[model samples]
Target: SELRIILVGKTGTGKSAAGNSILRKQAFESKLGSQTLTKTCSKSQGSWGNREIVIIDTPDMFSWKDHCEALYKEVQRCYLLSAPGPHVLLLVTQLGRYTSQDQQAAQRVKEIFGEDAMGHTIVLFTHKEDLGSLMDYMHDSDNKALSKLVAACGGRICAFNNRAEGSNQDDQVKELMDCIEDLLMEKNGDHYTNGLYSLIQRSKCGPV
Candidate 1:
């Protein structure tokens, strides 16, 4: 069976970098600065052990303010790329940079994929090298937003050190896959479907 995953988050949150780490290759273009390198949904495939993995890297879906039409098109493209829908949506965000906009990531998933999408969502925290302990950081009183974000997703969370290489990077990727597996089991091995996507879209825009 193939594992289908989609990446979504605010711009400059290292969504593409997380995708590369999962694929163990630079399958997606990732760089510094906040210019939105990924303008549309892109798909890449790779193998993790004997299992095939398909990852869909998307543009900043959170920035719908300026390019609402473009964002909607890219979002629909994201659904088509992961056609039949993604097994899980990785809501990427920086370790110590969770902002107001970041807090809305889960809500965006609801708006785009409906509330059921949260059941298949995982809060992926990037730049883990800056933090000593993810548990400690998440539980910190000042990180209430981060805590709430995790809670909104039923406590599903994972972290990635995008700069790590070799075994270190592999370890994080393996851990993330394990989390995905657990979610799959809990979900009875059912992935999200395009039916739900279209249903949500039609409801949002009368008879799409």
Candidate 2:
């Protein structure tokens, strides 16, 4: 059984950096600027315990937003780019970065993926370490606007470090794996394959 993880976010938000960390290699070039490193989703593989890891680094949704009709096409390319459809969609973000613009992107995510997307979606907030009173806020962090956003997302959220180094990343990734495990169990029940697919065939793609 393999796991598919899709990384989506705006440009310069360390998406590639996160992918590199997940692979535990500087194999990918992730930088912070107007320049783009990943024009489309790209992948690499590694292992964790008995589970296999497939990491997909996606282009910024904002970049495709300007072209409405082509957005879902791009999203499917991201998925197909990975060989099989990813079991989970990691909505990558940061701690102190979930601002109004981020929310707009989030909304676009829902629209783009449609409902049931959350069943496979998890928020991976990078730079979350920077948020003051992180625990206090994630719990009581709900006001009105934020509360609605969290609720709309069905309370599915987690954290990661786009800038983590060495052993720190190992621990964080394990934590994330645990979180995903919980989701798979919760979503699919005791069936196996993290309950994501009793075995959803990893469909082949060659271009439409």
Cα displacement (Å) at residue 54, model 1:
0.4
**Model 2, stretches more than 4 Å misplaced?**
62-64, 67-73, 82-84, 140-145, 189-208
Model 1 misplaced regions, further than 4 Å: 194-208
Error (Å) of candidate 2 at residue 29 is: 2.3
Query: Which candidate number maximizes TM-score?
Result: 1
lDDT of 1 at 166: 95
RMSD of 1: 4.2
In model 1, pairs of residues that clash are none
**For residues 28-83, could you state the per-residue lDDT of candidate 1 as single tens digits?**
99988746688778999999877789999987777535444487688778877776
Q: Model 1 misses residue 66 by how many Å?
A: 3.6
Clashes of each: 0, 2
